Nucleic acid binder design. Structure first.
Lengths: 89, 86, 86, 84
RNA sequence: GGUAAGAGCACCCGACUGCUCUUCC
RNA sequence: GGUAAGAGCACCCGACUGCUCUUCC
């Protein structure tokens, strides 16, 4: 799987996961997140770009969207989503 | 009629504020607007865009482009989502 | 598709702070940065750029793009100067 | 100095706005606003006031050039604007 | 989660007041 | 006698933003 799913863990967890994927020869990886984690996704990309691969990375695609989920009180709600496909240059 | 800025800066306010700003711009003959945000508010930015497109102007608005970045403060993430009617 | 940005924001601190930030970014491998400012600091933004291109990296840094604008406050002017390695 | 040039100094921005608009209203199609040092922001102000408040959808930013001059060093800006 | 009320730090736009310097009637 | 327009410095106030925090629902 070339997908890094952003969650509640510190951003460095996902940064290191992504870096590990890139170092293992995986040409293209996809960082995915929804709701509050969206900014963390962006962080994950930027750190990967700005701390470890200052030139060896490019953003292939950014896609945003929405999905309906049932909250912890059984109420249907819309949640934003983001996917960032990046690859080595 | 003076030309308003086509930029909606997402900040600390509720999403509805920015949805209303964006829709006000679009309804006043502005063809393309840019939603900008930094840090956690990036989520709000996305919310705003989605809320503007799928809910209140359906089938009329295109996401022209999405640009992410970093701003030196330490650093913080940035996003700019350019959308337009189509 | 747009290449992610790296922004240095200008304020009222001594110009060398911002020059330092810019040079640091450029030396780390970032090939293009954006110097942003609002109001009076616009002058300093220009300063930063010039100081970057004339004192440290002569014949290495070029101006990619200059954009001026306005933000509602009343109103304040804005500048963005994108510079790039030749 | 060319006749289509507005040089920014220490005067309130309204003066330079008025000079620019006077030129544009007298039939001059393109004008250039020039400034140096701290007045640079004022130059931008002038331009922004002219194209957004006085003549909406009629003025284009043709070109912006920044530079340096020796006095110490001072920054310079030139902003060429034109009618659509 | 909240058009619930506040707080600290950083960053930054603008203003008042005092002082210094420049340019007048 | 008048005290304007700028450039600095000090202090402070009012917004915007970023990052945390407290209480309340």
């Amino acid at each position: 799987s070339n997908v890094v799913l952003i969650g509640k863990k510190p951003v460095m967890n996902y940064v290191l996961a992504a870096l590990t994927l890139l170092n293992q020869g995986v040409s293209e990886i996809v960082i995915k997140a929804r709701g509050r984690a969206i900014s963390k996704a962006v962080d994950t990309v930027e750190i990967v770009r700005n701390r470890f691969l200052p030139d060896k990375i490019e953003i292939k695609e950014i896609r945003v969207g929405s999905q309906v989920v049932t909250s912890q009180d059984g109420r249907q709600s819309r949640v934003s989503t983001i996917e960032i496909a990046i690859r080595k240059k």
